């Protein structure tokens, strides 16, 4: 089985450095060109570069040669990417991919891809979220009502959100985080019968493991 596993990602300060590794199994790595590709959150693929088997030839996207060095060690079956002078725009998932060259030596495909390793570049300090209620505006009736919980400005990911301490689970939706002003924000919603709220209490519980915090916010009518 052709298989890849990347490592070396994580959180790095702006202006910091790191070295990513892509270990290749299941084929003779010394016979193949290898490439690096990345994907910033919510966005598409961006090629970084590629390197031939004996490292005599490296192609790279011009904007990134200032920061990034591609190398390989065929004895270790490993591809590397040295990242220096890193910047916010380097936050991304980083993938290695094998180059398959077809018969005739004039066609190729990027056939097998690693699962990716995540790099986050940020100077943010650990920051617990500000949790706010989402309640309908002061109010026409339907048989269900949708309530929510704004989990604003925390760092790092993740947070964990529950409703009534885990007791409300059906029809809970917790949305992906967005990045604003160097901090993460997400929301969670839950739908309950109109006859149930506000007669009965509905509360969101938000934990931020990195801050060791866990807070409750009752959803109150406006």
């Amino acid at each position: 089985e052709v298989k890849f596993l990347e490592s070396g990602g994580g959180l790095v300060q702006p202006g910091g450095s790191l070295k990513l590794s892509c270990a290749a199994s299941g084929f003779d790595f010394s016979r193949y060109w290898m490439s690096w590709v990345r994907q910033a959150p919510g966005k598409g693929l961006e090629w970084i570069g590629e390197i031939n088997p004996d490292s005599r030839t490296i192609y790279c996207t011009p904007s990134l040669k200032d920061r990034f060095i591609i190398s390989r060690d065929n004895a270790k079956n490993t591809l590397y990417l040295q990242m220096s002078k890193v910047r916010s725009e380097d936050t991304a998932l980083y993938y290695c991919a094998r180059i398959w060259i077809y018969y005739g030596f004039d066609a190729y495909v990027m056939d097998y891809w690693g699962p990716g390793t995540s790099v986050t570049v940020s100077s943010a300090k650990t920051t617990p979220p500000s949790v706010y209620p989402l309640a309908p505006g002061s109010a026409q009736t339907n048989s269900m009502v949708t309530l929510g919980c704004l989990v604003k400005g925390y760092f790092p990911e993740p947070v964990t959100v529950t409703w009534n301490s885990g007791s409300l689970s059906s029809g809970v939706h917790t949305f992906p985080a967005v990045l604003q002003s160097d901090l993460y924000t997400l929301s969670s919603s839950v739908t309950v019968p109109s006859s149930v709220w506000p007669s009965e209490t509905v509360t969101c519980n938000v934990a931020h493991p990195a801050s060791s915090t866990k807070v409750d916010k009752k959803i109150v009518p406006r």
């Binding site: 490439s35 590709v37 994907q39 919510g42 598409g44 693929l45 961006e46 090629w47 570069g49 590629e50 192609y59 790279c60 996207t61 011009p62 998932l93 993938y95 991919a97 398959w100 077809y102 004039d106 066609a107 190729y108 495909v109 990027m110 056939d111 097998y112 891809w113 699962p115 990716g116 500000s130 706010y132 209620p133 989402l134 309640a135 309908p136 505006g137 949708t146 929510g148 704004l150 604003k152 939706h173 949305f175 992906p176 967005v178 604003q180 924000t185 997400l186 929301s187 919603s189 406006r222």
Partner: protein, 212 residues
């Protein structure tokens, strides 16, 4: 400064034939661009499908094929299957670097079309006391998983300070997304009518509120 352009999103049904295309800002795509097609399936699983314009990768199903069509490179799925719902990236070679297109989300209808449930929330009083205001528009239970979101404040579309998540899968296999409008508290106080508008499959769902 080569740019590669793809359709943002296409929809087909199982058994139909669909073609995705790939355009170059330098002119016509040629065999010397060695067009590649890469499939992205959920949990960031990438797989090469076509290389060198028209070669299937080893092991790729015969229903996938590549060609040039006019100015453009093309990926054709002849007899689409529901498992082919995915994002497809094309990549073109320009002598010494590779450029990916922006990707095409391909929906292969595997469940009924479902219009979004949209909820708009005003800023909380507690947030306003920090001199900030965030409006939240939640969007659930839609399929296909493609929406466009716009915000208006007293008839002015918002071009700064709005942010929308990419659609993500629900446990019931429909899609969800959220959108945010960031304001100062003074801005909140100085305007009256607020609207989040969600367009899905050519129809707009609008939710609005008035301050105070």
């Amino acid at each position: 400064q080569a740019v590669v352009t793809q359709e943002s999103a296409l929809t087909t049904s199982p058994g139909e034939t669909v073609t995705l295309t790939c355009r170059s800002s330098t002119g016509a795509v040629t065999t010397s661009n060695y067009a590649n097609w890469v499939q992205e399936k959920p949990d960031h699983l990438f797989t090469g499908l076509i290389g060198g314009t028209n070669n299937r990768a080893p092991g790729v199903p015969a229903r996938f094929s590549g060609s040039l069509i006019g100015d453009k490179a093309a990926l054709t799925i002849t007899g689409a299957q529901t498992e082919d719902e995915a994002i497809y990236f094309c990549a073109l070679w320009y002598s010494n670097h590779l450029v990916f297109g922006g990707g095409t989300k391909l929906t292969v209808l595997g469940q009924p079309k479902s219009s979004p449930s949209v909820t708009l929330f005003p800023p909380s009083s507690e947030e306003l006391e920090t001199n900030k205001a965030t409006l939240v528009c939640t969007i659930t239970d839609f399929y296909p998983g493609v929406v466009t979101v716009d915000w208006k404040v007293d008839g002015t579309p918002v071009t700064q300070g709005m942010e929308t998540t990419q659609p993500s899968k629900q446990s019931n296999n429909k899609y969800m997304a959220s959108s945010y409008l960031t304001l100062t508290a003074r801005a909140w106080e100085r305007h009256s009518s607020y609207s989040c508008q969600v367009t899905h499959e050519g129809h707009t769902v609008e939710k609005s509120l008035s301050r105070e």
